[PDB]
Amino acid sequence: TREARISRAKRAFVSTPSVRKILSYMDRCRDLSDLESEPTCMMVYGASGVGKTTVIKKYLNQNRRESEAGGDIIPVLHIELPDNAKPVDAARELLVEMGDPLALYETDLARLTKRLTELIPAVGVKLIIIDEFQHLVEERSNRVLTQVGNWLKMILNKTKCPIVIFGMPYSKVVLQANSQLHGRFSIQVELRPFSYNGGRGVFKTFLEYLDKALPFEKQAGLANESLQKKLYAFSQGNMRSLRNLIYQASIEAIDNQHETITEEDFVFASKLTSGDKPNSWKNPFEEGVEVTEDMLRPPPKDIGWEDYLRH
Amino acid sequence: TREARISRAKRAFVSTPSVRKILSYMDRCRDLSDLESEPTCMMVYGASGVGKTTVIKKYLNQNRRESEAGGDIIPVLHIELPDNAKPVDAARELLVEMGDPLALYETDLARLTKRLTELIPAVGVKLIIIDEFQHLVEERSNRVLTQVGNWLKMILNKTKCPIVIFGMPYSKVVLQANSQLHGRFSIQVELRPFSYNGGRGVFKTFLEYLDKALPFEKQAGLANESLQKKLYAFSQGNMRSLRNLIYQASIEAIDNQHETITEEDFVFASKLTSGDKPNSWKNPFEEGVEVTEDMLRPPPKDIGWEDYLRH
Amino acid sequence: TREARISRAKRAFVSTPSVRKILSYMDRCRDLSDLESEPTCMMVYGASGVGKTTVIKKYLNQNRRESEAGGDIIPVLHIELPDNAKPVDAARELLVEMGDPLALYETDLARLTKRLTELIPAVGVKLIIIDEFQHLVEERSNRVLTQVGNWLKMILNKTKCPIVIFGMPYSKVVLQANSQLHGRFSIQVELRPFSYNGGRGVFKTFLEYLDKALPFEKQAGLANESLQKKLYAFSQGNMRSLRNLIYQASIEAIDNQHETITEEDFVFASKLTSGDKPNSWKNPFEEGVEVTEDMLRPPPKDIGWEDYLRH
Ligand SMILES: Nc1ncnc2c1ncn2[C@@H]1O[C@H](COP(=O)(O)OP(=O)(O)OP(=O)(O)O)[C@@H](O)[C@H]1O
Ligand SMILES: Nc1ncnc2c1ncn2[C@@H]1O[C@H](COP(=O)(O)OP(=O)(O)OP(=O)(O)O)[C@@H](O)[C@H]1O
Ligand SMILES: Nc1ncnc2c1ncn2[C@@H]1O[C@H](COP(=O)(O)OP(=O)(O)OP(=O)(O)O)[C@@H](O)[C@H]1O
């Protein structure tokens, strides 16, 4: 099999214009603020499993590498607020990820804020990439905790730094509660999945570049009107499901060695990674079942609101 | 880009007569009280994102600079109460802000008040500026806590000093609860946003002075009946949204160098900072869409009551 | 402006026959009790911003000054109970006010009582004054806590001294609950605001004495049939509102120096102190409108019951 081929098969990153826009907006949002006046700020929406973490890692790799290699600078962070997050727990994390491992033994929203606001300029933070806000909305109850959003408002008033605050599109409610919290985070973005299935667009070139990035030296197997339609039929929007199917196909192709990912391992790959899909969803690969046009309607505008619309 | 141009592009402060009145009333309220008799006291209302913090910063810059440069005096303060504020938390913040970091570890509304009342005359405080009262009114429940109000009453009764107590216009309910605290703070002010859109008033001269403050040497582009109506069409009252559009528009003129902020960067800058706006609100810049007179009505009298009228 | 003029302008205290009655009754209440038999006791009702604290401070200044100048005697005490008062917290305040810093760190209704009872005769307390009974009644619920009143009964039974217990009139409800506490506090008083507005009464002589106390050398400007009714229209009962208007007027007179407080600064003074007044109230000074006799009806019998009658 060889570790490098499977490694490169898993790490086959190509950039959709949405990702390029987000990377440009991040680079902008970083370059704009001079760590003196009130920062510009930003919020990304996206959905459940599109590539938010991957975009953050891609940004971290190009940005933080050379600065971190020099010494203890770490210009950019990676935060992930816990389940039913409180300002203590957020600030505890903000400290934990930022160099110093101390201030987690016995601190209760007193001196941790002061030392965090004192050390942020000293260490040299130029941006904060917060990843998680799905937790601030409660699971059963329709209530949303504001304490964290207010604490973010206060630390943003105290120390000046751009904040990116990634979170599912139902997390908008978190901002809608507190007036100027909605007001402050003005610049806003959708990282929504692929809409059109027909081809000769973003999906076709994405699969073409992906097939160029795949480990097999016998050219692209995908980018054909017959095959592309079934891949969209399998994975509607979620790039996770698509990349999983491609990965499962690739490892099935290198196993009992083949030249390309031909129409024989896709049926197994599809049957394998069809656990997360609903009962209503149908597998296009399972048998001789012709893909239907009505099934390939674009993903709803309420794509990441399902968890919120449960209650 | 050059940091100085972008710094001066961000920091382009001009004073509307409302701000001048607040600065005059602040100067008055400080000059009146002689730290012996009962103080005159003051409350500023305003709304969510008009210029409350900026008015306080402008006052702090002109007042506190020369005094603070001398030594440990700090004649004026800046306080910001936490979410669901309690007298312990407000007093802890009052002490934490006042130089000395002690009385932070273990104090339970016992000796912190006595030492605060003892040290306030010693350091030489001439006025206090409390910023935030939105927290005292609960999010879900209609209840408003008066513990902080009675502590403010008690500390005002014990030690004599002017207090400015900023807070969004639904914060009035905090005063309306406690009969004395309503009667104590007699001097009252609106820092409400701009009303008229047509021109030849406060908005036109504000934009004209802002254009004179902008970094471009090729004169003013704004303050024209053709253009300035769309700026009011974009941002009804909130100066935040206007200044954000101006900043992004300016940034987009420095990037791929231009002479002035002409009608080409405004469209993308408008599309950029159209996240905080409601779904009902329409973008005038997006396409060839002529602004409608009915949309340019003045902002409602209940401008900062929405959060209260939710519940 | 000068500190002496503004100091004397603020500190312009003249005595109302009601104040003289309270002063006489308090002097009597002190003189009668010999710290051996059961004390005579007293309760003063008043209302919000009439002059209870000023009467207490006047009494403190005339009585305690000579005794305090001699040494550690402090014959008379000042207490102002915390919000949602408990016997431990009242006793803590009663101790920390009277010299001793200790009995503050760790005391839970155990030894503070005995040491208070032991050292009250030693230091030589001839009378006690509690400022507020609003805290015993809850904000939301109509329920009243008896613990503080029962502790007052208990400590009155143990250490026998006069207790004056000032508090806004619906505080009567606190005594209406506990019959024995009601029985003890027999001597009772209204410190009610000014009722008559016609002229040639307590209001005219009060204003004349105030004008004699004002800093301007060239005789009284007020106490005229033209101005008295307008001053009464502005401030119905509340002496706070009246004295605030007089103060603000006096400042607007000494600023851009005039000969006297003319009826050109009263419009600004009235406009400035127009925050705490309800929407139903109409400002007489604002425009050139003749004041209506119907609006100058005397204030109601339940003047300081509104906040209690809300629920
Ligand atoms: N341009 C791209 N080319 C190829 N694969 C991509 C690209 N962008 C994202 N992916 C893949 O899509 C998947 C995104 O998963 P990821 O965990 O980043 O999603 P997420 O929305 O952040 O979810 P999570 O809640 O797990 O953080 C990964 O398998 C990643 O490799
Ligand atoms: N006279 C002025 N000229 C130009 N810009 C101004 C002027 N006054 C205020 N601004 C700008 O308007 C904005 C005011 O934001 P500020 O933080 O004061 O709002 P706020 O009402 O205190 O809200 P919050 O504290 O909830 O964030 C800033 O961008 C500030 O630079
Ligand atoms: N005889 C008097 N002549 C002139 N001014 C007076 C007189 N008595 C009281 N005042 C003034 O009336 C005001 C009374 O304020 P004070 O703090 O005593 O109010 P209060 O009724 O005790 O209310 P609270 O304790 O709830 O604040 C002060 O401005 C005081 O100077």
Q: Residue A32 and residue B306: Cβ atoms within 8 Å?
A: no
CB contacts, 8 Å: A43 with chain B? 275
Cα gap B209→B246, rounded to integer Å: 13
Backbone φ and ψ of C78, nearest 5°: -125, 120
B241 lies within 8 A of chain A by CB: yes
Contact C230, C285 (CB under 8 A): yes
Helix or strand or coil: residue B43? Answer: strand
CB contacts, 8 Å: A181 with chain B? none
**Closest Cα in chain B, distance from residue A176 (Å):** 9
> What's the CATH superfamily of A3-189?
P-loop containing nucleotide triphosphate hydrolases (3.40.50.300)
Contact A178, A149 (CB under 8 A): yes
Hunting for tokens 């990965």 — which residue is that?
Answer: A247
Q: b or e along C195-225 (b: 16 or more beta carbons within 10 Å of the residue's beta carbon)? A: eebeeeeebbebbebbbeebebeeebbbbee
Q: Residue B48 and residue A185: Cβ atoms within 8 Å?
A: no
Among C303, C185, C180, C179, residue whose Cα is nearest residue C236: C303
Residue type, C127: L
End-to-end Cα spacing for chain B: 47
Give residue C11 CA to ligand 3 midpoint distance, Å. 10
A188 lies within 8 A of chain B by CB: yes
Nearest CA to ligand 2 atom 19: B49
Tell me which chain A residue has its CA closest to the CA of residue B84.
A147
Give residue C30 CA to ligand 1 midpoint distance, Å. 82
B105 lies within 8 A of chain A by CB: yes
Cα gap B150→B130, rounded to integer Å: 15
Give residue C53 CA to ligand 2 midpoint distance, Å. 40
Among C240, C164, C84, C174, residue whose Cα is nearest residue B151: C84
Contact A81, A202 (CB under 8 A): no
* Breaks in chain A (C–N > 2.5 Å) following residue: none
> What's the CATH superfamily of B17-189?
P-loop containing nucleotide triphosphate hydrolases (3.40.50.300)
Contact B91, B113 (CB under 8 A): yes
Cα gap C124→A232, rounded to integer Å: 91
Hunting for tokens 């209690």 — which residue is that?
Answer: C308
Tell me which chain A residue has its CA closest to the CA of residue B11.
A37
**Closest Cα in chain C, distance from residue B14 (Å):** 25
Ranges of beta strands (E only) in chain C are 43-44, 76-79, 127-130, 188-189
Cα gap C40→C34, rounded to integer Å: 10
Hunting for tokens 């002010």 — which residue is that?
Answer: B189
Q: b or e along A30-60 (b: 16 or more beta carbons within 10 Å of the residue's beta carbon)? A: bbbbeeeebbbbbbbbbbbbbbbeebbebbe
Cα gap A78→A166, rounded to integer Å: 11
Q: What is the 3-state secondary structure (H, E, C) of C139-164?
A: CCCCCECCHHHHHHHHHHHHCCCCEC
Pocket lining: C54 vs ligand 3, CB cutoff 6 Å: yes
The helix (run of H) or strand (run of E) holding residue B66 is helix B52-70
Helix or strand or coil: residue B180? Answer: helix
Backbone φ and ψ of A286, nearest 5°: -50, -45
Given phi > 0 = left and psi -120 to 50 = alpha, else beta, which region is C214?
beta
Contacts of residue C20, defined as CB under 8 A and 6 or more positions apart, other chains included, come to none
Among C256, C251, C255, residue whose Cα is nearest residue C273: C251
- For chain B positions 119-158, those within 8 Å of chain C (CB to CB) are 143, 146-147, 150-151, 154, 157
Contact C163, C43 (CB under 8 A): no
Burial class (CB in 10 A: 0-12, 13-18, 19+), B148: buried
For residue C169, what are its two tokens?
A: 């009139």
Looking only at the bridges linking them, the beta strands covering B43-44 and B188-189 are parallel
Q: What is the DSSP letter of C128?
A: E
Angle in degrees, CA B145, B49, B56, rounded to 5: 80
Cα gap A69→B72, rounded to integer Å: 41
Q: What is the 3-state secondary structure (H, E, C) of chain A?
A: CCHHHHHHHHCCCCCCHHHHHHHHHHHHHHHHCCCCCCCCCCEECCCCCCCHHHHHHHHHHHHHHHHHHHCCCCCECCECCCCCCCHHHHHHHHHHHCCCCCCCCCCCCCCHHHHHHHHHHHHCCCEECECCCCCCECCCCCCECCHHHHHHHHHHHHCCCCECCCCCHHHHHHHHHCHHHHHHCCCEECCCCCCCCCCCCHHHHHHHHHHHHCCCCCCCCCCCHHHHHHHHHHCCCCHHHHHHHHHHHHHHHHCCCCCCCCCCCHHHHHHHCCCCCCCCCCCCCCCCCCCCCHHHCCCCCCCCCHHHHCC
Cα gap C233→C197, rounded to integer Å: 9
Please report, for residues A155, A293, B139, the alpha-carbon distance to residue C207 in angstroms, rounded to integers and kept in the order given: 52, 90, 47
Contact C241, C235 (CB under 8 A): yes
Contacts of residue A195, defined as CB under 8 A and 6 or more positions apart, other chains included, come to A298, A299
Do A and C touch, counting CB pairs below 8 Å (3 needed)? Answer: no
B61 lies within 8 A of chain A by CB: no
Q: b or e along B229-260 (b: 16 or more beta carbons within 10 Å of the residue's beta carbon)? A: bbbbbbbbbbbbbbbbbbbbbbbbbbeeeeee
Closest ligand to C-alpha of residue A135 is 1
Cα gap A27→B90, rounded to integer Å: 38
B86 lies within 8 A of chain A by CB: no
Q: Which of B83, B92, B100 to mutate to test the interface with A (most CBs of A within 10 A)?
A: B83
Cα gap C139→C169, rounded to integer Å: 16
Ligand 1 atom at shortest distance from the alpha carbon of A10 = 31
Backbone φ and ψ of C266, nearest 5°: -60, -35
A185 lies within 8 A of chain B by CB: yes
Cα gap B11→B6, rounded to integer Å: 8
Q: b or e along C281-297 (b: 16 or more beta carbons within 10 Å of the residue's beta carbon)? A: eeebbeeeeebeeeebe
Residue type, B123: V
Contact B112, B90 (CB under 8 A): no
The partner residues of A43 in beta bridges, in order of sequence, read A188
Contact B224, B203 (CB under 8 A): no
Cα gap A177→A192, rounded to integer Å: 24
Q: Residue A186 and residue B105: Cβ atoms within 8 Å?
A: no
For residue C66, what are its two tokens?
A: 């000579």
Resolution for the entry shown, Å: 3.5
CA atoms within 13 A on the CB side of B213: 18
Expt. technique: cryo-EM
For residue B263, what are its two tokens?
A: 């009608």
Pocket lining: C304 vs ligand 3, CB cutoff 6 Å: no
**Closest Cα in chain B, distance from residue A114 (Å):** 9
Tell me which chain C residue has its CA closest to the CA of residue B36.
C7
Q: What is the DSSP letter of B31?
A: H
Helix or strand or coil: residue B5? Answer: helix
Residue type, B43: M
Residue type, C260: T
Tell me which chain A residue has its CA closest to the CA of residue B310.
A177
Looking only at the bridges linking them, the beta strands covering A188-189 and C76-79 are unpaired
- Pocket test of ligand 3: the residue of C7, C54, C133 to mutate, having most ligand atoms within 8 Å of its CB, is C54
Backbone φ and ψ of B128, nearest 5°: -125, 140
Closest ligand to C-alpha of residue C244 is 3
Give residue C242 CA to ligand 3 midpoint distance, Å. 10
CB contacts, 8 Å: A151 with chain B? 82-83
Give helix then strand counts, H and E, for chain B. 13, 2
Q: What is the DSSP letter of C76?
A: E
C10 lies within 8 A of chain B by CB: yes
Helix or strand or coil: residue C78? Answer: strand
Helix or strand or coil: residue B128? Answer: strand
Cα gap B213→B9, rounded to integer Å: 8
Burial class (CB in 10 A: 0-12, 13-18, 19+), A66: exposed
Q: Where are the alpha helices (DSSP H) in C185-277?
A: 202-213, 225-234, 239-254, 266-272
Among B166, B175, B168, residue whose Cα is nearest residue B144: B175
Tell me which chain B residue has its CA closest to the CA of residue A28.
B251
